[PDB]
Amino acid sequence: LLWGLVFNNSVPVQNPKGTTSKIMVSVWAFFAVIFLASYTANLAAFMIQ
Amino acid sequence: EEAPFVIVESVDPLSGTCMRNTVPCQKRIISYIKKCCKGFCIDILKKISKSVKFTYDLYLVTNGKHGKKINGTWNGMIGEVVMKRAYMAVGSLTINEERSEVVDFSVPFIETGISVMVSRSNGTVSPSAFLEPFSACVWVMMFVMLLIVSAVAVFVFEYFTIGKAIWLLWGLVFNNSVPVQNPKGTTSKIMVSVWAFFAVIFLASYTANLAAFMIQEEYVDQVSGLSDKKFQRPNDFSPPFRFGTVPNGSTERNIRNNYAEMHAYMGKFNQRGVDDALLSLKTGKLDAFIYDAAVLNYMAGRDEGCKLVTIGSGKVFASTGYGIAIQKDSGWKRQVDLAILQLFGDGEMEELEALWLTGICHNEKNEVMSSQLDIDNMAGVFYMLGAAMALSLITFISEHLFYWQ
Amino acid sequence: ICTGPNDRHTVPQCCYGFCIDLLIKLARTMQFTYEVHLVADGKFGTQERVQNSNKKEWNGMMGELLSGQADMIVAPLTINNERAQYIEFSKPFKYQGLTILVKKEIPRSTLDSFMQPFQSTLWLLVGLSVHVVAVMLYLLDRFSTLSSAMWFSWGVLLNSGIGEGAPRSFSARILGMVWAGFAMIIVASYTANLAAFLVLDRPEERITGINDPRLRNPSDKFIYATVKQSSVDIYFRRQVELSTMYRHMEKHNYESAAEAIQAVRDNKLHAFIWDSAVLEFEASQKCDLVTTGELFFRSGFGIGMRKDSPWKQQVSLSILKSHENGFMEDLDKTWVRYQECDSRSNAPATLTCENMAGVFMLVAGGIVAGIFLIFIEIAYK
Amino acid sequence: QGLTILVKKEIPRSTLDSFMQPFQSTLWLLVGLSVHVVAVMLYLLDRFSTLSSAMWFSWGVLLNSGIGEGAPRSFSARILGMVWAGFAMIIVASYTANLAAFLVLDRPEERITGINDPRLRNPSDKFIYATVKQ
Ligand SMILES: *[C@@H]1O[C@H](CO)[C@@H](O[C@@H]2O[C@H](CO)[C@@H](O)[C@H](O)[C@H]2NC(C)=O)[C@H](O)[C@H]1NC(C)=O
Ligand SMILES: O=C(Nc1ccccc1)N[C@H]1C[C@H](C(=O)O)Nc2cc(Cl)cc(Cl)c21
Ligand SMILES: *[C@@H]1O[C@H](CO)[C@@H](O)[C@H](O)[C@H]1NC(C)=O
């Protein structure tokens, strides 16, 4: 699941229950969305030189 | 010398009194303390002497002023031509009427007037940022295709609920809000998988284009002109900002003696010496600056970096010219004119200009990265959010509206 | 009133305008009674040899002043040296210069089709490789759910959430974990390339003044000229460093000053040389046509008088004092300042439907493919 | 041969500082407030014709995750969330665009160009340069 989330949501799976777990995973998703975004940003540079 | 039109320079012990290409300003100023001078108008005198061919001294002014009078008594270079102690005066000098009356004036050779200088800008971006990358047409064709494909889903699953498929589909465009009941049936799934393709192309193309509007220019950023309330109303719209000029000069009478408030308001924020205002505007001490045209159009183009630019140079205020002042009614006034009107034809004017006047920031500078705390320009989407909230409240009103029946 | 002899028809009509405004203003100062008429020849005038050895005459209104017909000129009459030897000029009231005209460059000319950033090869390449890896996963799961895996694969590329498949193996798992990475990479690179195409599509830079090197010697994609026998050639031909452009123009010349605008708007002239304050008032009105930012010949018009009228100095003083109160500025605002249109650098080219329509064609393709494919369920059942 | 000028290597990597940089702290807290705002609004609109549920749903959809299986049972909440999602997408989009802008138009400095470089027409004291005397 985690590895899948980074690469923009392959396929849903068994979501771990428990409030604390869900908090941690929701935090991880933030790092994800920042990462993929920054990637596309920079890869939109090398094609301008 | 009060500008990059005449330059004062001390004496050199090596090559005589000083270098070539300069002429001795031999002025027994205070009591034959020699200096020497070069620059722009010096060049034009060194070409006047090529078609009138006379001899001339070069002595400066007792008062170092620009020509305001008091009690009818005249100061400045004018003040020392009115008494005809000196047959002729050139250099940096405007042309008004109260000066045009005492003495005469030649044909002007470089046009000037009034403009404004201000620290340039930050990088602003239009509030319309969000809406830009599309014509409104696609934005309705969206709903069109949504409804038609939902009808096709009706046709398909004839062989969910149609008040629900819209939810899933509309969700998919905006990057996958939340999974819901996936309609079964192979044909349906094919149609929806097709729709997802349109989605991924759409969001992509969007981000692409919205990554353009933030790479082009902005920032007119300052004013319209002397007619703005910003100027004439000192505290109405924005209380604290303040500007000024330098007194003692020509550009006074063409504001005071025709405008009312700005004189009494600037009477508390004037600076002795020119570049004092440059220092002030370097560190935000003063907001705006008014002065002659050409001195400004030069002082900007040769700073460290063009953080200080004219307010839309194309507009000028009280456009007049420099010139060459002659004692009253001398027979020379014609020749010099006949003289100078040659040099405009022979291209030499542009030549001397390029010899002194050109500025560094002539090209359009890079539109700066606009890092944003800009709640202001992104506000429109928040306001559409609120509009959604209002649509929510009225839709809830519709609940009771049906409920009483 | 205006007695125009160029209707041989001398006809009384009316005339007005910026200059007329200045004249009617100035009148109140010095008690002027005045008829007004036009010039039969319809040209300014210059020194020209006549009778092939006899005299030097002025072929126009300037002569009409010197001849004894006129007594004062008010029109955009230029100032230079040559004329200054027989006239007396007031100070100049309206500076000006030399500029060029070109039609509006490009409002929206950027994109063609959505597949454009890729090229057809890689499309079919990934379209094959997806089924490839699909069936590979199928076998790897089968021998320690075919249509399932086919979905899973051909979906994960499409960001959807269709199907609840999964791998039960270990091999399939470790494979898909990077299949996903390839998926993300494709979409990323696609966005980047489309951004590049949309940001560095500079159509063309608006030609910059007379010193534009494209004019050092012109390509035939630069049609431009003046009106034959103007007062601009006195700086074109009389200058030596322009004789090449002089020859290009004498061959490319247009008929009338209005024919210039007619030809530019007709996509037959794509740049035009003239004075600033002659075109600039037509750009801000003919919104499809704008000027270049540069100034070439520094000069400003003025009022002409016969040599040593007893008020030369006087009218010059009045025109000075009347230039800074508000007359010239306000008269420009109400008479030369439409400000109707404002161009800028190459805009970021808002998207239109007509080049984004291509994807809707695949939408319609799905639509039509539906009612075909539907009965296949009924058949297979 | 000819006459040239020497300058050290200009910049190999001098671009970015921190990830929050393209935004500025104000809008961060603004959206952080508005998310709970719309959350509780949805809560009431569903409650009076599942609180922690809606709190998730909201504060998740911004984060692209797939956490929680909540939903709206009302009609008002539905029509509201349908555009809450749009605002979500818009924020991330604009964020990417701004970061791209910051990474593409950070020209540190252009290497000074020959003797006719105008910066040398009269030098700033940030231009130390000379020859060997005699
Ligand atoms: C220039 O303006 C200043 C005031 O704005 C005045 O300079 C004063 O300078 C003169 C000459 O040095 C002194 O006699 C006065 O006493 C100064 N004023 C005061 C209040 O002390 C003067 O009006 C102008 N002087 C010149 C030379 O232009
Ligand atoms: O070129 C011409 N006549 C011409 C007509 C048809 C074909 C060729 C030449 N006139 C010039 C000269 C004259 C002037 O005082 O500048 N009138 C005048 C006034 C304005 Cl506003 C602008 C110009 Cl260029 C002109
Ligand atoms: C933005 O403007 C303000 C005041 O004008 C000042 O911080 C500075 O000039 C600009 N910012 C930067 C980073 O230069």
The DSSP code sequence of B220-284 is: --S-S-TTSHHHHSSSSSSSS------SSSHHHHHHHTT-SHHHHHHTTS--SSSTHHHHHHHTT
CA of B120 to the centre of ligand 3 (A): 9
Chain B CB contacts of D87 under 8 Å are 381, 384-385
Residue B367's CB is within 10 A of a number of other CB atoms, namely 17
Chain A CB contacts of D65 under 8 Å are 5, 25-26, 29
Residue B10 to residue B35: CA distance in whole angstroms: 5
Residue C248's CB is within 10 A of a number of other CB atoms, namely 19
Contact check, Cβ <8 Å, B179/A12: yes
Contact indicator for C162, B193 with CB cutoff of 8 Å: yes
Contact check, Cβ <8 Å, D64/A22: no
Residue B214 to residue D93: CA distance in whole angstroms: 12
Q: How many helices (H) and strands (E) does chain D have?
A: 3, 0
Q: Is the CB of B63 under 6 A from ligand 1?
A: yes
DSSP single-letter state for residue B3: B
Is B390 in CB contact (< 8 Å) with chain D?
no
Contact check, Cβ <8 Å, C347/B216: yes
Nearest ligand to the C-alpha atom of residue C42: 2
Distance from CA of C75 to the nearest CA of B (A): 19
Contact check, Cβ <8 Å, B211/A44: yes
Task: Please report how the helices D25-47 and B379-403 are oriented relative to each other, as an axis angle in degrees rounded to 10.
Answer: 10
Burial readout D26-35 (b: 16 or more C-beta within 10 A, e: otherwise): ebeeeeeebb
Interface probe, candidates D74, D80, D84, D121, chain B, greatest B C-beta count within 10 A: D80
Contact check, Cβ <8 Å, A26/D65: yes
Mutate to test the pocket of ligand 1, among B248, B269, B270, B271 (most ligand atoms within 8 A of CB): B248
Contact check, Cβ <8 Å, D68/A25: no
Among C175, C177, C155, CA closest to C165: C155
Q: Which two tokens stand for residue C295?
A: 């100034």
Q: Look-up: residue for tokens 């201000």?
A: B118
Q: How far from each other are the two terminal CA atoms of chain C, in whole angstroms?
A: 95
Mutate to test the pocket of ligand 2, among C18, C20, C43 (most ligand atoms within 8 A of CB): C43
Contact check, Cβ <8 Å, A4/C188: no
Among B143, C188, B215, A8, CA closest to D86: B143
Contact indicator for C163, C148 with CB cutoff of 8 Å: yes
Q: Which residues fall within 8 angstroms of residue C236, CB to CB, at 6 or more apart?
A: C226, C242, C245, C246, C249
Contact indicator for C120, C283 with CB cutoff of 8 Å: no
CA of B261 to the centre of ligand 1 (A): 22
Q: Which residue in A9, A37, A41 is closest to D66 by CB distance? A: A9
Nearest ligand to the C-alpha atom of residue B122: 3
Is A2 in CB contact (< 8 Å) with chain C?
no
CA of B248 to the centre of ligand 1 (A): 8
Residue C302 to residue C96: CA distance in whole angstroms: 11
Residue B192 to residue B198: CA distance in whole angstroms: 10
Interface probe, candidates C160, C184, C193, chain A, greatest A C-beta count within 10 A: C184
Distance from CA of C164 to the nearest CA of B (A): 10
DSSP single-letter state for residue B318: E
Q: Which two tokens stand for residue B3?
A: 């500008």
For chain D positions 26-55, those within 8 Å of chain A (CB to CB) are none
Neighbours of chain A (3+ CB pairs under 8 A): B, C, D
Task: Quote the Cα angle for B118-C343-B300, to 5°.
Answer: 25
Phi, psi of B401 (to 5 degrees): -60, -50
Residue D17 to residue C151: CA distance in whole angstroms: 43
Give the binding-site residues of ligand 2, using a 6 Å CB cut-off. C 43-44, 76-78, 227-232, 257, 275, 278
From edge to edge, which strands make up the β-sheet containing C272-275? C272-275, C98-103, C289-291
Q: Which two tokens stand for residue B87?
A: 């047959």
Residue C319 to residue C25: CA distance in whole angstroms: 10
The coordinates were experimentally obtained by cryo-EM
Q: What is the resolution of this structure in A?
A: 4.0
Contact indicator for B263, B247 with CB cutoff of 8 Å: no
Residue B122: beta bridge partners? none
CA distances from residue C80 to B346, B366, C86, D66 in whole angstroms, order as listed: 11, 40, 12, 79
R_g of chain C computed on alpha carbons: 36
The letter for the amino acid at C290 is V
Residue B387's CB is within 10 A of a number of other CB atoms, namely 11
Contact check, Cβ <8 Å, C363/B199: no
Q: Of how many residues is chain D composed?
A: 134
Burial readout B40-61 (b: 16 or more C-beta within 10 A, e: otherwise): bbbbbbebbeeeeeeeeebebb
CA distances from residue D44 to B177, C13, C361, D54 in whole angstroms, order as listed: 21, 79, 43, 10
Chain B CB contacts of C159 under 8 Å are 175-176, 196, 199-200
Q: Is the CB of B221 under 6 A from ligand 3?
A: no
Which stretches does DSSP call E strand in C131-267? none
**Alpha-carbon D120 to chain mean position:** 37
Q: Which two tokens stand for residue D50?
A: 């599942």
Residue C201 to residue C191: CA distance in whole angstroms: 16
Q: Which residue in D26, D76, D119 is closest to B396 by CB distance? A: D76
Contact check, Cβ <8 Å, A26/D100: no
CA of B30 to the centre of ligand 2 (A): 55
Residue D56 to residue A21: CA distance in whole angstroms: 13
Residue D65 to residue C332: CA distance in whole angstroms: 62
